[PDB]
């Protein structure tokens, strides 16, 4: 297939929670997809295995991918530099959507978020590049450890990840 599929095995304070899988739209945003896919496999020598969802806001989203600083201020792409917003063709249409976190235009690194609601207002500001295939039930569980300002109540980690 053109579009790869990636999985995360989620753990909560080390306890297994469940697997989430994601279709990545390489057919619309190949550069963004290829970044997340490669960070998911560890094939660059670094990436999301072990990293944590540092900001979870119930009824909004789960954000993670800061595998360098673990708190939102880090993250790195495979490109040796932050990369441009490829496009904004895909929209934030509901739960499951997978989108780039970013710190302003054209500053994509490794941080991403998994929407848990419709967030249409993000359209044009965050590059949408995949969607949850299996295990939205597990993202819904993860949401239960979030808070209004994003602080989590337990450590929500990507205990393992790769490409299927």
């Amino acid at each position: 297939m053109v579009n790869p599929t990636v999985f995360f095995d989620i753990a909560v304070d080390g306890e297994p929670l469940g697997r989430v899988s994601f279709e990545l739209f390489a057919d619309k945003v190949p550069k963004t997809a290829e970044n997340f896919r490669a960070l998911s496999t560890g094939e660059k020598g670094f990436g999301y295995k072990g990293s944590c969802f540092h900001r979870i806001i119930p009824g909004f989203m789960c954000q993670g991918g800061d595998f360098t600083r673990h708190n939102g201020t880090g993250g790195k792409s495979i490109y040796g530099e932050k990369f441009e917003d490829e496009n904004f063709i895909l929209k934030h249409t509901g739960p499951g959507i997978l989108s780039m976190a970013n710190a302003g235009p054209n500053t994509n690194g490794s941080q991403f978020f998994i929407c848990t609601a419709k967030t249409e207002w993000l359209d044009g500001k965050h590059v949408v590049f995949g969607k949850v295939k299996e295990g939205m039930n597990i993202v819904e569980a993860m949401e239960r450890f979030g808070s209004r300002n994003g602080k989590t109540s337990k450590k929500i980690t990507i205990a393992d990840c790769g490409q299927l």
Binding site: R55, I57, G59, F60, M61, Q63, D66, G72, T73, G75, S99, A101, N102, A103, G104, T107, G109, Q111, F113, T119, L122, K125, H126, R148, N149, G150
Partner: protein, 135 residues
């Protein structure tokens, strides 16, 4: 919420007309600009006619300060949560890329970010730079 008044502006006008860049402009700017939003600070500055070189020194100060601010306040990654606001940027504090409402929200949040008090400090540094050149 009400924009600074034509009436307060008149006064600021009359002050700058005679006290253009004596030390006394500074204590006056600070009183007339009490509780001012960035927009109002800019409204004040705009009524100044001529004095182009001086205004430009002031602008240069604002521009320098705003860049320093940005430096000292890196933006966090991730999408802004609902009912939350982006952290202001230099240009936001200076009223060039922000709105009234936005300005208004910050000065109120608990704890607030008093973008009006911040910009007003920058302006004052600019006025000290003018005063030092001319007097």
């Amino acid at each position: 919420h009400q924009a600074i008044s034509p009436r307060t502006l008149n006064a600021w006008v009359k002050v700058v007309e005679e006290k253009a860049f004596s030390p006394e402009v500074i204590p006056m700017f600070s009183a007339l600009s009490e509780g001012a939003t960035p927009q109002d600070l800019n409204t004040m500055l705009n009524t100044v006619g001529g004095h182009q070189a001086a205004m430009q020194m002031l602008k240069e100060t604002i521009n320098e300060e705003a860049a320093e601010w940005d430096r000292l306040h890196p933006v966090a990654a991730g999408p802004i949560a609902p009912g939350q606001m982006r952290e202001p940027r230099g240009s936001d504090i200076a009223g060039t890329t922000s709105t009234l409402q936005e300005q208004i929200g910050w000065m109120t949040h608990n704890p607030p970010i008093p973008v009006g008090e911040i910009y007003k400090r920058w302006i004052i540094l600019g006025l000290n730079k003018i005063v030092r050149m001319y007097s």
